[PDB]
């Protein structure tokens, strides 16, 4: 995935071949591990973009993306 930013915050452009794998990227505050559980398809015009909240010792609820060290934005296409 391509690591960029959205208003100072890290942003992940996730491609199709990353479905099912732990997303890791270094940050001043250590290594960040986001988990993507998404309709994740091929990167195209039909993108969706939203935030993966920070979750410390809390079970996830009503979400398919979350990181454990620093909240991150994520973007991926839905095409197939």
């Amino acid at each position, epitope marked *: 995935f391509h*690591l960029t930013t959205r208003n*100072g915050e890290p942003h992940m452009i996730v491609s199709r071949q990353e479905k099912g794998k732990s997303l890791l990227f*270094k*940050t*001043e505050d250590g290594v960040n591990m986001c988990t993507l559980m998404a309709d994740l398809g091929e990167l195209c015009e039909d993108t969706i973009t939203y935030k993966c909240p920070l979750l410390r010792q809390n079970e996830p609820e009503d979400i398919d993306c979350w990181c454990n060290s620093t909240s991150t934005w994520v973007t991926y296409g839905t095409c197939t």
Partner: antibody
Amino acid sequence: AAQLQESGPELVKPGASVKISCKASGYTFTDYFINWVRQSHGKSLEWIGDFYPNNRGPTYNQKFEGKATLTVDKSSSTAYMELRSLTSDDSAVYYCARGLWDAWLSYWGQGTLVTVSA
Amino acid sequence: AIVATQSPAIMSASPGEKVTISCSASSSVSYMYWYQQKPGSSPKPWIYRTSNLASGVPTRFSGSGSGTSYSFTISSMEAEDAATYYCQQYHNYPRTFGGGTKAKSAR
């Protein structure tokens, strides 16, 4: 164990170009931003660049757009700054600091002095 | 695309005094920093976010602010404080520095 190792001090003539290296170690080079930083003698710091070595996206401070050109070699975990058409005002230190998610310069290099002189 | 403007350019102080150093951004950011730079040394990070100490920073330093205002505070100056200190913003592209504040000993 995070370290940045800049090149050594450079003279140089006006109209020359220089080519400052940056050699990261003790972290995933691809994972973090690389940020050059002018400081002239008796001035403050002056941000210049930022280069994400996963995808080789720059940005530039407008003031240094046309003056600088950032580039990274993944293979050697090295960042490079060219400076072009050097003038006496370009005489400064140039520090390479890595970011850590946000724009926060959390590890600096030892700083390359460049000294533009006739 | 935002300037940062840091309040005393200088600053005389004596050991024990409680220095304060402000930073004023031309639009609302939440990601700042305060570096510290010694006469023949790299800058070091001292504050991160708007109020996070960096690890291996004395609890003598503190950072607070929001809404374009931002403020370093040195709660009882040590000899080893004497330095420049340096706001950033890292909330929009061209990451900006302030013009630096130059805390020097007095007598």
